[model samples]
Target: QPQQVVVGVSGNGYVTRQQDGARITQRGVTHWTNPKSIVSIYFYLHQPTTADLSLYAKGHSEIKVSYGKKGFKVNLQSNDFTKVPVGSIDIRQAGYVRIDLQGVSKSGEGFGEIKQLIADNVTGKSNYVKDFSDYWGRRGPSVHLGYALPEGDTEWFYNEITVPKEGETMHSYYMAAGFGEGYFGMQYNSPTERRILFSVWSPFDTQNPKEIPDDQKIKLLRQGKDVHIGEFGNEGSGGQSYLKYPWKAGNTYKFLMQIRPDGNGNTTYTAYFYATDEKEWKLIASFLRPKTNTWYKRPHSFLENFSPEQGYLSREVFFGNQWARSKEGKWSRLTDATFTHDATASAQVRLDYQGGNTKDNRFYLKMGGFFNESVPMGTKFYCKPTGKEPEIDWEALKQL
Candidate 1:
């Protein structure tokens, strides 16, 4: 019987070099346990630039996989002797799943000695990466070309564009496509409120850019009250997020909000914008996840959309960007939310984007960033109902 696969943090050091990025040695101590049936191996990584992985064995190690990269790289290196088991692991699926290794070894044995495996899997993939620049610049911007796939999708794309300046409403182009048939979206960091918001637009019904305002074009706009789940509008296949917008096309979906910190006097926010064309959502450029507060000061941190969830938060970054709270910057806890009813407890609760209202008012706003609900919201949770402090469970999320 196959043991239930689980996501566990390894004893690996969290050391990341900006110039060199995150490098995993194929020869490091085995970080995973042997699978009972050895059906599939997944590597979910979150970072910027590109990523790749290497495969090795004593002599007869052979594996095969199929995949591609949107804004990164996926590489597969073999010795040319062992019959590599052919499988699929595309770069578009980055940050969500680690380098997925699926296939039977050439030997009749199941997952033989796991030695020197999946190197070169983070920097980039082996083959079939689109000229991301061409796609994002040409067809995507004008025609709204959203690509859909079995593993995932690409809702938007861009490169080397200036970061949206403070107090500025920036507008760009994104061709929202998906086999899952949902919407296109944008995620931004607010300097006032300690929150992040994701706005989306759907084109399942029409495509003419001028017809973008039609009611069908609107999909889902989420308030931070509940951590967003599923793929934008689709049910299940989701993650925790702060904001949501009805799916639409053509029209510019603006993020006119702020990032507000707590009593800590500092705040930071990171977000991602994407669209689901077929099965998965394509991630356009975005704020890179904050590994530490210091890295946020660097300019490069402002324009990176390459994290596992394609997002991050850092109070230090906000302080540096908006105010000067250098020494006081710390990881402050976000607000609490009661998704379920706790008849006994009393806590104050607020919600936004409850339905599909793309209006700007029903979202997080502030001068430093913004304030909204916590992330990874559960459908049925319990907490206080009428007070300022509520016990929030960040782990109350869906695992599928």
Candidate 2:
């Protein structure tokens, strides 16, 4: 007996290693015609073991199953769904197994709609997105770094972000400064568009923005030039704002956020973006949350791949020069943080997530790409504090 891993649930096919027009959909590999594309099926083995591979597919094609150059060629002769043996692969160690199926000849239209990859008489346990949410399963895991802030009311949070060239994948949100109720970050919206996004969650606790009561909704106070202010929902109903800024990789950008409570039981959250090349700070947005009175509580950073189509690609970002400004006009440097991942990683559905301090005292988060190395979800790490504080012009910031 063999365990059949459904291709629609755990497998992905890509051309140029990007994406190939929904080739690996919920119905398995439905649209695969390009000979350049490769269908990769992934699963984790608990220990070093071996399993003979097979595929339940339809159509006629000659394909090569490759596992680190140790795989056998197989022929799909049937037009109907049938099991085709793909030979055995040696498991060198306990980790993720990527079985790549590549076309060998142009004799057929495509690999012909593969449905499942069967592992026969496996010696060890396996893990993948068998019964998980297929949407999030392909979106991969989101990793976070919860910075240990200073004790007291933090009215302002400041941080700097630098995305290396290797980490500049599209559809990634590299959050730099996060408060108790909202996040301020930069997002790779598309090839021609990038953004400085700021958002706050309403207290209504609803996913639909239309369902939120007027009193419980977030109120937009002010915004910078050409900054789009609107409502965003589904993730959490709230006020969202973003500025179309062409932020580039390998460049350090500064992020500043202010969260303070008015005496009238309302809290205001504001975000600012500093372009080092521009030599100026631009106000992103300011929003007010009703029936709330709290200063900055939780400051954190997160790296996530929002597009399921781009989840197979790895995204990384570095957060450095983190500091918090209290109401007493004193600044504290954040040097220690706790690494955490989302449910996608904790449930063992996806294991490619890691976060820790860089050798140069910056905290970094790396996720996606299905690599075997992963840091423990709750590991706490620390780096030596850079005693130098960020130099900001208070008067000039208020002038904006």
Q: Tens digit of lDDT per residue, candidate 2, span 242-342?
A: 99999889999999999989889899998999977788899888899998999998899999998777766899999888899998889999888899999
C-alpha TM-score for every candidate: 0.21, 0.94
lDDT (CA) per prediction: 0.23, 0.83
lDDT of 2: 0.83
lDDT of 1 by residue, 238-275 (tens): 22244333323232222211122223322222223322
Off by over 4 Å in 1: 1-204, 207-306, 309-379, 388-400
* Clashes in predicted model 2: 0
Off by over 4 Å in 2: 1-18, 106-108
